[PDB]
């Protein structure tokens, strides 16, 4: 997913992080609560977070 | 660079089903392939109370070594061996006999 | 009868612990010896 995220900016990436992080939290809630058939979304969302932070460190100025 | 693919028609070279022709179903990590209706084992499937519960003797396909099968040519009507060559800009498999691309 | 081992974790930690060994040159070598022999439990700690 990194190719399109590169077009986005630091803001518009920090917010995408929080939204991803919230989605992470709700999935974590749904998972423990017996719900969430689709167990695969946890790795799916965990890796998008990793993807947005790698780009932020790539846009800090380095 | 694999010679036997997932949905290729093969013929068995060594075994109870020497001479039989099947279609490959799975290419396992082990260098073994499952071929439709070939290495039929008659299992003794235990019952489970939860999911797919009926205990039963199932006749499923077992896995044979990829070494023990060959792609069927279907033009010659015989087994054959695979080679790899580059056509227009892509790696393609060809029948050793007749040099035709699969 | 009173036996020889009378556990104290502080006495154990001070007499043979990791900091006690890294304190002296010869304790640094005890660990170097245990590190080379591949001991799972380098010292009495924990």
């Amino acid at each position: 997913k990194a190719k399109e995220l590169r077009e986005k900016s630091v803001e518009e990436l920090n917010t995408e992080l929080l939204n991803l992080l919230r989605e992470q939290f709700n999935l974590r809630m749904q998972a423990a609560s017996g719900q969430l058939q689709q167990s695969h979304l946890l790795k799916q969302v965990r890796r998008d977070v990793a993807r947005v932070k790698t780009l932020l460190n790539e846009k800090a100025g380095a | 660079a694999a010679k036997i693919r997932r949905d290729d028609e093969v013929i068995v070279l060594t075994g109870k089903d020497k001479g039989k022709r099947g279609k490959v179903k799975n290419v396992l990590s082990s260098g073994k392939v499952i071929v439709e209706g070939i290495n039929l084992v008659k299992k003794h499937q235990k019952p489970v109370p939860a999911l797919n519960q009926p205990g039963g003797i199932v006749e499923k396909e077992a896995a044979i070594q990829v070494s023990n099968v060959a792609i069927f040519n279907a033009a010659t009507g015989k087994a054959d061996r695979v080679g790899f060559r580059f056509e227009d800009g892509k790696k393609v498999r060809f029948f050793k006999s007749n040099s035709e691309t699969i | 009868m009173k036996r020889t081992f009378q556990p104290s974790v502080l006495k154990r930690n001070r007499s043979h612990g990791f900091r006690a060994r890294m304190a002296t040159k010869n304790g640094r070598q005890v660990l170097a010896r245990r590190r080379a022999k591949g001991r799972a439990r380098l010292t009495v700690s924990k």
């Binding site: 992080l21 974590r28 809630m29 998972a31 423990a32 609560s33 | - | -």
Partner: protein, 93 residues
């Protein structure tokens, strides 16, 4: 506590024991599995931010993980932190 990124990592899961259902019914107290490095202030701000419910007080304890056997192998489960979160009055979820 204040950073939103930190609050979204602090609450792990709700605990679904009988003592916790009692705590909900009687004492207005939800029992949560939280991060081992979660402090009482972080859990309060997290619940108040995430579940949108008022929090009176947070009690906490660290559960020691259990030694188990898997055939011959010993193994230990990871310590986890339990949080009793007393609400003012109002539960939704």
């Amino acid at each position: 506590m204040i950073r939103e990124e930190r609050l979204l990592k602090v609450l792990r899961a709700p605990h679904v024991s009988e003592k916790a259902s009692t705590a909900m019914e009687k004492s207005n107290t939800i029992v949560l599995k939280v991060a081992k490095d979660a402090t009482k202030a972080e859990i309060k701000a997290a619940v108040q931010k995430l579940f949108e419910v008022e929090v009176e007080v947070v009690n906490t304890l660290v559960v020691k993980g259990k030694v188990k056997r898997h055939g011959q192998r010993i193994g230990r489960r990871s310590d986890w932190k339990k949080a009793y979160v007393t609400l003012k009055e109002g539960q939704n979820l």
